[PDB]
Amino acid sequence: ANPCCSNPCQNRGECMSTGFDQYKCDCTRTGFYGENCTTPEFLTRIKLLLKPTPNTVWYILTHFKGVWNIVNNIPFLRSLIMKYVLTSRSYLIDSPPTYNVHYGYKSWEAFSNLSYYTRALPPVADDCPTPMGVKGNKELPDSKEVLEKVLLRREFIPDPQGSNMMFAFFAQHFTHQFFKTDHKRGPGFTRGLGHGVDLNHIYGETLDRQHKLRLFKDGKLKYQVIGGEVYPPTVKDTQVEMIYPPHIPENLQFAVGQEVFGLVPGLMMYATIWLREHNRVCDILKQEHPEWGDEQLFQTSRLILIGETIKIVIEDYVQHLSGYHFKLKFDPELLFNQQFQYQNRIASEFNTLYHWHPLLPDTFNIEDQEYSFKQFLYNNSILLEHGLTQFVESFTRQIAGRVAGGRNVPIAVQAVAKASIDQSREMKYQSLNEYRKRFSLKPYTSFEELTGEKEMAAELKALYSDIDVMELYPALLVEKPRPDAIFGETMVELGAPFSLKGLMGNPICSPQYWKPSTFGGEVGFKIINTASIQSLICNNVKGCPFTSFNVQDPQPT
């Protein structure tokens, strides 16, 4: 019924119904005009000729290693490139946010209600004939069939880029601070009202939980020492709510910021490292400021760890994931003379695309043990038996799975993967090609162009019939990967805007915050600007073991 169901407006023009069977497109500041915003302005069709494809840019960034070695050592030139990366990626994100799962039009409810995930594309209206608007059949293909035919893993497919379990668990630990779906309300709702990197997974979402976790001395968090090494406090000693099965011992009920981090020993590893890091910074600050009280010590340390996190995510995590030879840079100063909104709202589509289930291996290998999913889940005693040093040594060398390419979702989590498909449909996501156009990509003209092969493409065409009906999430997992890469084109061109915007949109990156006094002086400031994934492990893990997000990296001496 709704005349906008066909998604007629192009180039980010907004569709509005003007009667029962008529629409109008708002082409304001899109660079286009005409009934569907498809006729380019003069300056627009000029930029369209010069603009290189995402695959062309990707090639240049992952080749010519010698040239980039020159660029990386020219500070003014490195700053210029990184500045363009930040601004060009951010422009794809609406800030202030607009639509959500219940609003295909802008409203004050959609803007102010922080319990929603925001939406990069408005949901398909309820009164549309087909799930994707007007194209395709009345029902989408069986999610169970899609899962079994192109998604399930027959044999483990390793990541060509060499991403290890240090990476996989960092990814899950880091993103679980702003990907906290409120399942009481629905998949379109969140419990992370910070909508970004506030480190609530360390300090707790609410003030009540924060105070239960704090020691109220030297600004430190509560802790216990087992075998000479520091671990999170117990549920008994703190009274914070954690999710543990009833058969778990009292001593092993670790209490951390996020309540689900007891699920995996891999998550509790990072929970422990950051806990040590917080208290480490506390003592350093107390050294500089013997006149400070507990409160200022805690708060300043939290700001520093926020800085450390963004520093690490950009210059180590994203750096590895990008595969670029260009040396990325965390420098808030780069945006001081640019137009940029220091705010961010977590998009539902960001949550969906980050469901990197193929990352998980068949077993978790520590020392000479091959723990299964059954053995690994909720077993914190594994962490105490081996210790963090052993965990780092083992996980640095265990490779993770290839996300794109298809048929690599471990069967142990097939229910979670199916849920990602169903909830995607429940939230009325638009098609893959609609999201590709949203992020300046050419739509796929066939299933073969999508997968880059024949066998999986044929299975999908039998299920979907039309390429313009193909769903976003399963496409991301079956998409033809870039040569020797972990991702396809769609994952990067969608993920990058969300990711970089969420990191730089933090208030500590704003000019009024980004100064030494905010972080307790030059010493505290330097902790942020020199932070790295290696230094984090080196300072907080026994023996200062070698670590990296890449199994391919040689360990010296």
Ligand X SMILES: CCCCCCCCO[C@@H]1O[C@H](CO)[C@@H](O)[C@H](O)[C@H]1O
Ligand Y SMILES: *[C@@H]1O[C@H](CO)[C@@H](O[C@@H]2O[C@H](CO)[C@@H](O)[C@H](O)[C@H]2NC(C)=O)[C@H](O)[C@H]1NC(C)=O
- What are the catalytic residues? 176, 354
Total site size for a copy of itself, rule CB under 8 A: 55
User: Helix 388-395 vs helix 265-288: angle between axes, to the nearest 10 degrees?
Assistant: 120
Nearest to 220 by CA among 288, 296, 289, 287: 296
**382 lies in the site for ligand NAG, by CB under 6 A:** yes
229 binds ligand NAG (CB under 6 A): no
Give, as ranges, the residues between 179 and 198 that touch ligand Y (CB under 6 A).
185-186
CB atoms within 10 A of CB 445: 11
The stretches of 198-264 forming alpha helices (DSSP H) are 200-203, 207-213, 235-238
Rounded Cα gap, residues 219 and 206, in angstroms:
17
Could you tell me the sign of the dihedral formed by the alpha carbons of 136, 139, 145, 146, in that order? positive
- Which residue minimizes CB distance to ligand X? 88
Minimum CB–partner distance for residue 496 and ligand IBP (Å): 3
Please report, for residues 193, 254, 303, 358, 393, the alpha-carbon distance to residue 376 in angstroms, rounded to integers and kept in the order given: 31, 16, 33, 17, 17
Q: Residue 123 CA to chain centroid, in angstroms?
A: 21
Contact between 420 and ligand IBP (CB under 6 A)?
Answer: no
Least separation, in Å, of the C-beta of 175 and ligand IBP?
9
Within its chain, how far is the Cα of 136 from the centroid? 31
338 binds ligand X (CB under 6 A): no
Residues 209-228 that bind ligand IBP (CB under 6 A): none
Residue 520 Cα distances to 84, 292, 304, 509, angstroms? 31, 10, 9, 16
Biggest CA–CA distance in the chain, Å, is 74
What x/- string results for residues 133 through 162 when contact with ligand NAG is judged by CB under 6 A? ------------------------------
Contact between 113 and ligand Y by CB under 6 A: the answer reads: yes
34 touching ligand NAG, by CB under 6 A: yes
Select from 374, 372, 377 the least CA-distant residue to 361.
372
Taking the C-alpha atoms of residue 442 and residue 434, their distance in angstroms, rounded to an integer, is 10
Helices 54-62 and 489-504: crossing angle in degrees, nearest 10, is 80
- What is the closest distance, in whole angstroms, from the C-beta atom of residue 413 to ligand X in the complex? 32
Place of tokens 């080749």: 63
- Binding site partner of 8, from a copy of itself, ligand X, ligand NAG, none, Cβ cut-off 5-8 A by kind: ligand NAG
Angstrom CA distances, 12 to 9, 108, 435, 437, 491, stand at 7, 21, 11, 9, 20
Binder among 5, 25, 37, 89 for ligand X (CB under 6 A): 89
Length of the chain: 557
Residues 163, 548: contact at Cβ < 8 Å?
A: no
Which of ligand NAG, a copy of itself, ligand X, none does 112 bind, CB closer than 5 to 8 A by kind? a copy of itself
> How far is 379 from 262, CA to CA, in rounded Å?
8
The rounded distance, in Å, linking the Cα atoms of 396 and 387 is 14
Q: Contacting ligand IBP (CB under 6 A), which of 322, 408, 423, 451?
A: 322
324 labelled binding-site residue: yes
Which span sits near a copy of itself by CB under 8 A: 268-276, 338-346, 440-448, 490-498? 338-346
Whole-number CA gyration radius for the chain: 24
CA 53 to CA 60: how far, in whole Å? Answer: 11
> What residue 7 binds from ligand X, ligand Y, ligand IBP, none (CB within 5 to 8 A, per partner kind)?
none
| Near ligand NAG by CB under 6 A: residue from 8, 54, 204, 257 | 8
Shortest gap between Cβ of 20 and ligand IBP (angstroms)? Answer: 41
Look at residue 385 and give the partner it binds from ligand X, ligand NAG, a copy of itself, none, a contact being a CB closer than 5 to 8 Å depending on partner kind. Answer: ligand NAG
Which range binds ligand Y by CB under 6 A, 78-86, 203-211, 432-440, 485-493? Answer: 203-211
Identify whether the C-beta of residue 237 lies closer than 8 Å to the C-beta of residue 222. Answer: yes
Q: Select from ligand IBP, ligand NAG, ligand X, none the partner in contact with residue 318, using the beta carbon and a kind-dependent cut-off of 5 to 8 Å.
A: ligand IBP
Minimum Å gap between C-beta 60 and ligand X is: 5
Convert 421-434 to b/e letters by CB count within 10 Å (16 or more is b). bebbbebbbbbbbb
Quote the CA–CA distance of 98 and 89 in Å, as a whole number.
18
Question: Residue from 13, 54, 307, 387 that binds ligand X (CB under 6 A)?
Answer: 54
The two beta strands, 229-231 and 224-226, are antiparallel
**Which listed range, 6-14, 82-90, 150-158, 293-301, lies at the site for ligand X (CB under 6 A)?**
82-90
What part of residues 301-320 is at the interface with ligand IBP (CB under 6 A)? 318
Which positions make up the binding site for substrate?
89, 324
Residues binding ligand Y (CB under 6 A): 113, 115, 185-186, 206-208
Residues binding a copy of itself (CB under 8 A): 2, 14-20, 24, 26, 28-29, 94-96, 98, 103, 105-109, 111-113, 194, 198, 207, 288-292, 296, 299-300, 302-303, 306, 338-339, 341-343, 507, 510-513, 515-518, 520-521
Which positions make up the binding site?
89, 324, 357
Residues binding ligand IBP (CB under 6 A): 85, 89, 318, 321-322, 328, 491-492, 495-496, 499-500
Residues binding ligand X (CB under 6 A): 51-52, 54, 57, 60, 81, 84-85, 88-89, 440
